[PDB]
Subunit: 112 residues, 3 copies
């Protein structure tokens, strides 16, 4: 599985990144039952004038996760809820300034 977090530069500190990484990992290994050694979390930062919401300069938080297909929605939704809650708990950011998406990738489409 691959989780990518995109925020405007200056949003996350090193401690917050470390926290989110350990948490997101634990969330996946708990909701899916997979070994952590295959769970990858990536953090990317955007320049202040490179993030827009409704056509205006903003600071949205986008977290995207690619997981393996063959899982019920209750599982995906559980991951969505947990990831959403933990980011808001770590950063204190607003809910509508946070977007989380977990998509399916067929196992036949990946090689690890």
């Amino acid at each position: 599985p691959l989780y990518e977090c995109q925020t405007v530069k200056g949003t996350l500190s090193e401690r917050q990144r470390q926290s989110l990484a350990e948490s997101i990992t634990s969330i996946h290994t708990r909701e899916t039952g997979a070994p952590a050694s295959y769970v990858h979390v990536l953090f990317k930062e955007l320049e202040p004038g490179s993030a827009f919401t409704a056509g205006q300069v903003a600071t949205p938080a986008i977290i995207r996760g690619q997981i393996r297909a063959g899982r019920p929605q209750a599982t995906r939704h559980a991951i969505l809820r947990a990831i959403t809650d933990v980011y808001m708990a770590v950063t204190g950011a607003d809910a509508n300034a946070v977007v989380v998406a977990v998509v399916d990738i067929p196992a036949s489409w990946a090689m690890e």
Copy 2:
């Protein structure tokens, strides 16, 4: 909905990113009938010599958009065309060096 623009470092200015963000937002809100508040546009730059076309160093432009599934193909094509026409007009780029993709995301795969 999320739109991401990937170009070589130095391609877009502040004014251009503002224009493209406003343009993409307007195009999406019209064709899909979705509010602007949910429309997010991100800009990412690539280091010189890290973008390749036909095995050689080039400056392609990649704009990818993840929208809600359930809308007809004519709607998607209209979004594809408009974004492509706009980017070429704003930047002056070659059509053969511009790639736009609008993929469907199931409504229950995202949380916001």
Copy 3:
């Protein structure tokens, strides 16, 4: 066709990026029968400490390829194993620290 390579900043030399760009382009054109002019390879770098495996900081390598739908699995698999072998040869990375994915995008969903 679009191939993105995510690594920790400093992992790939410019010569390594060149070699990977050519071989990946070569593999795709060999297995699909598509012109090289449509093949785009992008190299993105992550800041050290912004890339995590399990719970801690690591140096994973993510190569994601977006190709067009309508092609059989054997084609995609051949691309997957080839890219995997080539990357581990060029860089010397561990197989457990390398992830390759090749996803489908319907021709109606892209424009170039």
